[PDB]
């Protein structure tokens, strides 16, 4: 079975350097043209570069010409991309695509690694309750949430009632603020008759900062 | 070559035929590919050479067209074909992808459940404020929300967040966050979030006043 | 320089039979059904599977004495055949490698469609000679038509 | 099955565009290589060329400069266009359908005569030594001509010889019979010729 | 351009005897040779393709063999319809060249030509030309030394018997009265001495 | 690197069926024909049958034509050759060879060869007989009536290896194996001993030779 | 089916000498498709030459192939000690793929003399009920050295068993063991048992014998 795996993309400042390596197994490497395809977190796919097999016919995207350098090693069955002078918009999941023989279309793709570029360091989350008041008391229902604000980096998993309450929990996608920090607002709908009777605590998990803090609302 | 996909979103029910369009800046060739990216996985090549199917791709996918007009048609749209589809121009370098049409589930129009949350008390002592307006269980995704302060509109200081279509009801949830500092928060008294959605007969405005929760 | 071309030819032979004869058993037909174009095809390494290196020798008077196609993929269930011209023939200073793919798609009317995808790797900044593309198209056409005539005349060959 | 025939003009002026058109019937156009061949007494059978059912023309190297073989799949009809025909292009042209191994099905074949002249003649001249029997017809350009003896009565012993083309561009045929050593005066011996292209009946008596 | 030669030039065999025809290629073609039987006045018909095989509808009496630059076609007990011209076609190299052909005649007792002479008609002399006619009847085609060039050939008159030939000597208005003797000579295998016919 | 390993040496009864396995590694197994070459003790090479995994067929020689069946398992990528109706003359070394090309049919990589011994007799312990003569003289050690191969014979507990001659074993007509091992020595020389180990019979015999 | 024959049947030349081996085919080998393998005594045949002219990978630059049609030659210029093996020629220009017969390239040396030693049967074998006489051919060259057995001056054909060892690596000299196996009664029938060797290196064929009673 054709399979490609990527190296990994760590936190890098806007101007650092990475080397994404792609190990390919299941097919003869010295006869296929390799490609790197980035996908920004929330945008469509974008071709980055392209390398042939024998003479290494190198092709680069318009936005990425002198910053990156793609190379390959058929003996090691590996494909490298040295990314230099990164910028904030180079954050994306990078896929190690392999072109079909004839027609240069990526038949098999790697799993991609999330190369993230930012200046912000690993900062813990800040959990703020979001509750209604006597203003909205109708339909025997309401919504209760907790805003996980100013955390870095992705991901942060927010459960409710320690995994007991799992119906109605809406974990929205994480948005990037003006700074490098993130935001998230997990909200669950609950019957209004349980507002003042049953406790509702959301548990937030941020592995890079290791803060197993909770918040009752 | 600016490679463009016309129907940036497509809401068609499971079983109904879907027709995805893709135009090119200039006539490239019959050389164009159609990839399918499900929400999270790596893209899976469906079509290459604009007509040829990749091995293992079900026969319900059919690519056609040439020049500056290509169409990917799904006849019997099953439940696993709801994903994003990209068209790829590999005639000349640099290679370009399309915008990516999101084929979504068609569901009868539902009015959102609209809620608004005042900023938390310890957020005040932190020096900032975040007022969130949430829409729950609405369809279609296209639904505008605008912040109103003292009956005056706001822009530029709000960021939206929309979850993916539910796997149970096939409906959306949206969360618009109005972010301000403490200084520009206490100088204000009236806060509202006007919601304009197709399902809503009239634009709802869930508002609260400062001073009380 | 990497340049992609696509052609879509037709045939009246069912896809399974045409793949069994034209693609799989192409070593025993091309020197027999079209001897005016190919003198002899022989697997100088491998036996037809992936990695096979077929040397195709042309008769006297043609511009190229021989070509070497490195068979890369042979999918029997979907009738796909990926090879790569790597030495001899048009591969000199200009060209370096011609990655070709032939897929035989069964049509509802009973015939078949050959979807052919070629990808030339020109060295440096050279262009693909239009005469080379025309010659490749003509060779493919004459081979396909000769195999089609072989299968039409001998209605029992290859099922 | 798969019967095919030409629809081309059989008389072409020199340095003109010879155009034959073969029509197929009773079979698919996608069955053979559609071939144009010509048979000439000076060169025998000769491959003018052929075409696959999709524009795949192979021409004879000695004719590729002035030959185009076109096909039309919609009407199942192919055609040969030979421009700048010289006097050496006169032949019997067969349109045919050839498998990979050889020409499987053939057409009727049309006699194309290049280096045309005026449709004239002919002139009949008797041949009788009268010492102790035939007539020659001469100077007619269109090849077909019928020569009968006493209004088609002497079918026994008659010998109509193939027409020969001299350097003047006209044909000369000769018809003879086997006469007994006697009966040369008891009854008459007259030959009548019917040049249909010149619609001329000529009767000559010895 | 592979020049095929075919031997013999013409073979005359009885209706039922076995016939053997040989085709020799110039270049070394492989076993790619096709045998065609063109009847006298029809389109040729394929008999043996690839020098050994035989298409459906061809009688089993035809058998091909050979390879390289040597091929053979054998007709075992040929019928009356097999008296035709046989061509060999190579398809190993475009252009696919045919062969000169080998006419197959009917064996028969050797006959002799009853040579006839014909002076030009006086009408033709009025026209300004003369055509001396020489007739050979019921013979085998060997040669006809019509002497004084101006030669005319004629053959193919064998239905149930042998051939018949004509020859024409073409002269101008004043060319024959110059030579009071303008005899015609004929040589034949079935003749004992070359027969000569002349007049004033 | 290309590597064609094989099974181990096998003993079979006459009329039985042997199965030799050849594991091929370092190349696309589906993409190379594999031939099976028999070689007797002194006879030349004669191929038995070939397998084409791509074309997915097999072709055997007219000489065998039915007693041999060539199968394969692409999953583990092995080639199996089964020989049926084994005869006493089928004892030979069997090689698996990788045909370089389908038209360039020369074998570039061979297996190590499985020795197949087809005989009626079964495992038997060796019989050791000293051989003393009755200048320079020789001392002999005759190993008779043992089966199967091989055996390992030496002298002086393996110390005496110079001037030794271990003649190859011969098949004596009762279906068994016999051989001799000799050592030269000047008459001026002291007693030597002969040790022999037969692993398949798990026997170790050490004997002495009377010195004149 | 192209039958291949190799000449000479068994070549024997001194080390360092140019050796030429000939492969002759019944039919013609198309496009000079002949392959020369070398098989050591106990190893799989390694490929030396393919295409009848070009050496394989990892082959020292002394094996040169030549020829075409029905006549091919393999040439070893400098015969190293790792070059005395059995050389096979296989045609692959016409299916079926057929091998040759092999040319055992031996080692030439000065003619040696066999030190024949006749050995009386062991008494233990006599207790077992049979008997086996052996006489040695230690260090003789060349291999062509016939041996005969005289039981009271009587030659028994089909009873003797000859076994020749492989060529020694030090002195490159052969050795043969001749065994005469008989029943105990057959042992106790005749009186004098001898073996004679007709070796080239022996001017007169010596017949070594032994006493039945004293031994």
XYZ file of N, CA and C in Angstrom, chain A residues 9-173:
495
model
N 5.652 19.858 12.253
C 5.905 21.282 12.286
C 5.684 21.872 13.661
N 6.752 22.371 14.271
C 6.695 22.925 15.610
C 6.395 24.419 15.541
N 6.294 25.039 16.713
C 6.158 26.486 16.788
C 7.448 27.138 16.312
N 7.327 28.074 15.379
C 8.473 28.783 14.825
C 8.122 30.257 14.696
N 9.066 31.116 15.063
C 8.855 32.549 14.985
C 8.845 33.005 13.528
N 8.266 34.176 13.251
C 8.197 34.653 11.864
C 9.563 35.035 11.320
N 10.296 34.037 10.837
C 11.651 34.231 10.368
C 12.523 33.039 10.695
N 11.943 32.053 11.373
C 12.652 30.832 11.699
C 12.834 29.920 10.503
N 13.118 28.644 10.755
C 13.347 27.695 9.674
C 12.915 26.306 10.118
N 12.307 25.566 9.199
C 11.900 24.186 9.415
C 12.380 23.322 8.259
N 12.330 22.009 8.465
C 12.656 21.048 7.414
C 11.632 19.921 7.491
N 10.589 20.018 6.675
C 9.552 18.996 6.650
C 10.042 17.804 5.842
N 10.149 16.647 6.484
C 10.572 15.431 5.811
C 9.383 14.496 5.651
N 9.372 13.775 4.536
C 8.270 12.900 4.159
C 8.845 11.548 3.772
N 8.548 10.534 4.574
C 8.970 9.170 4.296
C 7.854 8.455 3.549
N 8.185 7.888 2.394
C 7.218 7.233 1.528
C 7.566 5.759 1.398
N 6.570 4.897 1.589
C 6.769 3.460 1.508
C 5.575 2.825 0.814
N 5.818 1.708 0.137
C 4.794 1.008 -0.611
C 4.883 1.183 -2.109
N 5.743 2.076 -2.591
C 5.915 2.290 -4.018
C 7.363 2.667 -4.280
N 7.803 2.445 -5.513
C 9.157 2.826 -5.893
C 9.253 4.346 -5.984
N 10.130 4.926 -5.168
C 10.174 6.375 -5.020
C 10.858 7.061 -6.192
N 11.827 6.404 -6.820
C 12.669 7.045 -7.820
C 11.981 7.226 -9.166
N 10.674 6.977 -9.262
C 9.969 7.111 -10.528
C 8.730 7.991 -10.429
N 8.503 8.645 -9.294
C 7.325 9.472 -9.087
C 7.738 10.896 -8.758
N 6.917 11.849 -9.185
C 7.156 13.261 -8.931
C 6.427 13.673 -7.662
N 7.151 14.276 -6.730
C 6.590 14.608 -5.431
C 6.159 16.069 -5.396
N 5.262 16.379 -4.463
C 4.756 17.732 -4.312
C 4.471 18.002 -2.846
N 4.542 19.274 -2.476
C 4.094 19.743 -1.176
C 2.902 20.663 -1.376
N 1.809 20.381 -0.676
C 0.576 21.147 -0.822
C 0.168 21.643 0.557
N 0.159 22.956 0.746
C -0.268 23.471 2.033
C -1.760 23.780 2.013
N -2.375 23.687 3.185
C -3.765 24.095 3.358
C -3.834 24.932 4.623
N -4.166 26.210 4.474
C -4.246 27.088 5.625
C -5.409 26.663 6.522
N -5.332 26.944 7.821
C -6.405 26.510 8.724
C -7.681 27.307 8.520
N -8.457 26.929 7.509
C -9.706 27.602 7.217
C -9.823 28.025 5.769
N -8.814 27.693 4.969
C -8.779 28.036 3.558
C -8.659 26.759 2.736
N -8.645 26.922 1.415
C -8.507 25.792 0.523
C -7.063 25.377 0.330
N -6.884 24.305 -0.435
C -5.550 23.801 -0.709
C -4.771 24.793 -1.563
N -3.453 24.770 -1.402
C -2.578 25.655 -2.160
C -1.287 24.917 -2.461
N -0.966 24.787 -3.744
C 0.266 24.125 -4.143
C 1.471 24.953 -3.712
N 2.484 24.279 -3.174
C 3.681 24.926 -2.655
C 4.868 24.740 -3.591
N 5.191 23.496 -3.929
C 6.359 23.215 -4.751
C 6.164 21.875 -5.451
N 7.178 21.472 -6.211
C 7.118 20.268 -7.026
C 8.535 19.841 -7.365
N 8.810 18.547 -7.239
C 10.116 18.002 -7.587
C 9.927 16.768 -8.455
N 10.739 16.663 -9.501
C 10.741 15.490 -10.361
C 11.553 14.390 -9.684
N 11.859 13.323 -10.418
C 12.621 12.212 -9.860
C 14.096 12.265 -10.245
N 14.399 12.283 -11.544
C 15.783 12.108 -11.971
C 16.569 13.414 -11.913
N 16.185 14.396 -12.725
C 16.917 15.656 -12.784
C 16.380 16.693 -11.816
N 15.331 16.364 -11.064
C 14.747 17.276 -10.089
C 14.350 18.596 -10.759
N 13.348 18.491 -11.629
C 12.721 19.672 -12.217
C 11.949 20.386 -11.118
N 12.536 21.430 -10.567
C 11.976 22.115 -9.410
C 11.034 23.212 -9.875
N 9.836 23.230 -9.301
C 8.854 24.270 -9.564
C 8.331 24.776 -8.232
N 8.147 26.086 -8.123
C 7.730 26.714 -6.881
C 6.506 27.586 -7.114
N 5.713 27.746 -6.060
C 4.574 28.644 -6.121
C 5.055 30.088 -6.226
N 4.183 30.948 -6.751
C 4.549 32.348 -6.929
C 4.843 33.013 -5.590
N 4.018 32.740 -4.580
C 4.208 33.345 -3.270
C 5.412 32.787 -2.525
N 5.959 31.656 -2.961
C 7.060 30.987 -2.268
C 8.105 30.648 -3.328
N 9.100 31.519 -3.493
C 10.125 31.309 -4.509
C 11.513 31.124 -3.910
N 11.998 32.081 -3.125
C 13.334 31.983 -2.573
C 13.341 31.580 -1.115
N 12.154 31.451 -0.531
C 12.038 31.130 0.883
C 12.134 29.635 1.152
N 11.551 28.810 0.289
C 11.554 27.367 0.467
C 12.508 26.720 -0.525
N 12.866 25.474 -0.233
C 13.706 24.687 -1.130
C 13.334 23.224 -0.978
N 12.796 22.629 -2.035
C 12.399 21.227 -2.020
C 13.539 20.383 -2.568
N 13.753 19.223 -1.954
C 14.758 18.268 -2.387
C 14.239 16.871 -2.084
N 14.949 15.860 -2.569
C 14.523 14.488 -2.355
C 15.747 13.592 -2.285
N 15.555 12.412 -1.701
C 16.606 11.400 -1.611
C 15.941 10.063 -1.912
N 16.188 9.541 -3.115
C 15.572 8.282 -3.511
C 16.162 7.104 -2.749
N 17.433 7.192 -2.357
C 18.039 6.129 -1.565
C 17.347 5.991 -0.216
N 17.086 7.113 0.451
C 16.348 7.099 1.706
C 14.841 7.065 1.504
N 14.369 7.146 0.260
C 12.942 7.155 -0.054
C 12.235 8.283 0.697
N 12.833 9.470 0.635
C 12.348 10.588 1.428
C 12.287 11.851 0.584
N 11.412 12.762 1.001
C 11.199 14.038 0.328
C 11.259 15.151 1.363
N 12.196 16.079 1.198
C 12.411 17.147 2.158
C 11.990 18.487 1.572
N 11.498 19.360 2.446
C 11.201 20.746 2.097
C 11.783 21.621 3.196
N 12.833 22.368 2.870
C 13.460 23.292 3.807
C 12.761 24.637 3.680
N 11.995 25.003 4.700
C 11.251 26.255 4.723
C 12.053 27.271 5.525
N 12.498 28.330 4.857
C 13.285 29.381 5.479
C 12.564 30.714 5.345
N 12.820 31.605 6.303
C 12.213 32.935 6.333
C 10.689 32.843 6.328
N 10.157 32.056 7.259
C 8.720 31.868 7.354
C 8.036 33.167 7.769
N 6.757 33.278 7.415
C 5.943 34.419 7.802
C 4.656 33.911 8.434
N 3.875 34.848 8.976
C 2.678 34.483 9.724
C 1.640 33.776 8.865
N 1.642 34.005 7.553
C 0.675 33.363 6.675
C 1.155 32.023 6.139
N 2.334 31.563 6.544
C 2.809 30.238 6.178
C 2.273 29.149 7.091
N 1.515 29.507 8.124
C 0.883 28.503 8.972
C -0.162 27.752 8.157
N -0.059 26.427 8.151
C -0.913 25.568 7.347
C -0.553 24.125 7.641
N -1.465 23.222 7.306
C -1.147 21.800 7.319
C -0.544 21.440 5.967
N 0.643 20.848 5.989
C 1.386 20.544 4.775
C 1.212 19.071 4.439
N 0.805 18.797 3.203
C 0.588 17.450 2.706
C 1.689 17.078 1.728
N 2.180 15.851 1.862
C 3.184 15.273 0.974
C 2.447 14.532 -0.132
N 2.106 15.250 -1.193
C 1.346 14.660 -2.280
C 2.280 13.968 -3.258
N 1.790 12.890 -3.857
C 2.531 12.165 -4.875
C 1.743 12.232 -6.170
N 2.405 12.627 -7.248
C 1.730 12.727 -8.531
C 1.626 11.369 -9.199
N 0.472 11.115 -9.806
C 0.334 9.938 -10.639
C 1.267 10.044 -11.835
N 1.695 8.889 -12.328
C 2.595 8.837 -13.473
C 1.783 9.190 -14.712
N 2.086 10.337 -15.305
C 1.230 10.895 -16.325
C 0.160 11.759 -15.692
N 0.036 12.999 -16.159
C -1.007 13.964 -15.798
C -0.808 14.658 -14.457
N 0.350 14.521 -13.803
C 0.750 15.315 -12.634
C -0.396 15.682 -11.694
N -1.238 14.713 -11.362
C -2.315 14.903 -10.405
C -2.034 14.056 -9.173
N -2.253 14.636 -8.000
C -1.862 14.011 -6.741
C -2.841 12.896 -6.401
N -2.504 11.666 -6.794
C -3.393 10.543 -6.523
C -3.357 10.137 -5.057
N -2.169 10.056 -4.467
C -2.010 9.713 -3.062
C -1.405 10.879 -2.299
N -1.994 11.180 -1.148
C -1.590 12.295 -0.311
C -1.075 11.777 1.023
N -0.192 12.556 1.636
C 0.241 12.255 2.983
C -0.813 12.688 3.976
N -0.511 12.611 5.269
C -1.447 13.057 6.287
C -1.234 14.504 6.699
N -0.117 15.106 6.325
C 0.098 16.517 6.588
C 0.478 16.792 8.027
N 1.307 17.816 8.206
C 1.690 18.289 9.529
C 1.396 19.774 9.636
N 0.876 20.189 10.789
C 0.447 21.569 11.002
C 1.665 22.414 11.360
N 2.267 23.014 10.332
C 3.319 23.989 10.576
C 2.675 25.304 10.974
N 2.967 25.758 12.186
C 2.401 26.990 12.706
C 3.505 28.007 12.951
N 3.275 29.226 12.475
C 4.239 30.312 12.583
C 3.595 31.443 13.367
N 4.230 31.837 14.465
C 3.714 32.902 15.315
C 4.817 33.329 16.270
N 4.614 34.487 16.893
C 5.519 34.982 17.920
C 5.044 34.676 19.330
N 3.747 34.445 19.515
C 3.210 34.178 20.840
C 3.721 32.846 21.376
N 3.974 32.813 22.680
C 4.443 31.608 23.341
C 3.256 30.815 23.882
N 3.548 29.669 24.492
C 2.505 28.814 25.048
C 1.892 29.493 26.265
N 0.673 29.999 26.111
C -0.049 30.664 27.185
C -1.279 29.847 27.548
N -1.565 29.765 28.843
C -2.691 29.006 29.324
C -4.014 29.659 28.985
N -5.091 28.883 29.041
C -6.415 29.428 28.736
C -6.957 30.285 29.867
N -7.964 31.087 29.532
C -8.680 31.914 30.501
C -10.169 31.620 30.336
N -10.778 31.007 31.344
C -12.150 30.532 31.208
C -13.103 31.485 31.914
N -14.069 32.015 31.157
C -15.044 32.988 31.642
C -16.454 32.447 31.430
N -17.269 32.344 32.478
C -18.630 31.827 32.300
C -19.491 32.775 31.482
N -20.467 32.203 30.780
C -21.429 32.946 29.974
C -22.812 32.413 30.322
N -23.578 33.204 31.068
C -24.871 32.776 31.564
C -25.929 33.826 31.262
N -27.170 33.406 31.036
C -28.263 34.371 30.894
C -28.773 34.840 32.245
N -29.862 35.599 32.239
C -30.473 36.098 33.465
C -31.982 35.955 33.314
N -32.732 36.634 34.181
C -34.188 36.592 34.129
C -34.713 37.257 32.861
N -33.813 37.855 32.074
C -34.219 38.482 30.821
C -34.841 37.466 29.872
N -34.215 36.300 29.731
C -34.645 35.263 28.793
C -35.074 34.034 29.590
N -36.373 33.942 29.877
C -36.959 32.795 30.571
C -38.212 32.402 29.792
N -38.042 31.505 28.823
C -39.145 31.064 27.982
C -38.786 29.719 27.371
N -39.809 29.039 26.856
C -39.705 27.737 26.200
C -39.093 26.666 27.097
N -38.970 26.932 28.399
C -38.370 25.995 29.350
C -36.973 25.566 28.908
N -36.222 26.489 28.310
C -34.881 26.195 27.829
C -34.043 27.464 27.839
N -32.726 27.270 27.840
C -31.765 28.360 27.820
C -30.424 27.796 27.374
N -29.436 28.678 27.238
C -28.100 28.279 26.816
C -27.091 28.738 27.854
N -26.137 27.867 28.179
C -25.076 28.171 29.127
C -23.748 27.819 28.480
N -22.765 28.709 28.587
C -21.493 28.459 27.935
C -20.327 28.913 28.782
N -19.128 28.629 28.287
C -17.915 29.140 28.910
C -16.889 29.478 27.840
N -16.478 30.744 27.825
C -15.553 31.296 26.842
C -14.133 30.982 27.290
N -13.450 30.134 26.523
C -12.029 29.867 26.701
C -11.287 30.878 25.832
N -10.770 31.930 26.455
C -10.175 33.058 25.758
C -8.679 33.109 26.031
N -7.924 33.542 25.019
C -6.491 33.808 25.129
C -5.719 32.557 25.552
N -5.768 31.547 24.690
C -4.988 30.335 24.868
C -4.143 30.086 23.626
N -3.058 29.346 23.815
C -2.138 29.064 22.723
C -1.211 27.912 23.089
N -0.980 26.961 22.175
C -1.608 26.925 20.854
C -2.744 25.913 20.750
N -3.245 25.736 19.532
C -4.223 24.699 19.253
C -3.624 23.331 19.586
N -4.426 22.395 20.126
C -5.853 22.478 20.440
C -6.182 22.603 21.921
N -7.461 22.842 22.200
C -7.999 22.893 23.555
C -9.365 22.222 23.517
N -9.537 21.161 24.301
C -10.774 20.390 24.279
C -11.625 20.760 25.488
N -12.872 21.144 25.241
C -13.767 21.618 26.290
C -14.926 20.636 26.383
N -14.981 19.888 27.477
C -16.114 19.025 27.760
C -17.014 19.687 28.801
N -18.192 19.107 29.003
C -19.158 19.658 29.944
C -19.574 18.590 30.942
N -19.587 18.964 32.224
C -19.939 18.058 33.318
C -19.061 16.810 33.316
N -17.770 17.002 33.029
C -16.780 15.924 33.049
C -17.184 14.773 32.130
N -17.729 15.113 30.965
C -18.148 14.119 30.001
C -19.522 13.530 30.231
N -20.240 13.968 31.265
C -21.590 13.467 31.497
C -22.579 14.097 30.523
N -22.669 15.423 30.527
C -23.528 16.124 29.583
C -22.833 16.213 28.231
N -23.394 15.537 27.227
C -22.819 15.528 25.890
C -23.816 15.887 24.799
N -25.037 16.276 25.150
C -26.065 16.631 24.180
C -26.253 18.141 24.190
N -26.137 18.759 23.017
C -26.275 20.192 22.884
C -24.990 20.977 23.028
N -23.887 20.326 23.393
C -22.607 21.012 23.535
C -22.127 21.411 22.143
N -21.940 22.709 21.925
C -21.507 23.243 20.638
C -20.117 23.841 20.811
N -19.095 23.078 20.434
C -17.713 23.550 20.476
C -17.400 24.193 19.131
N -17.372 25.517 19.106
C -17.123 26.252 17.880
C -15.654 26.155 17.481
N -15.342 26.390 16.208
C -13.937 26.431 15.796
C -13.183 27.547 16.502
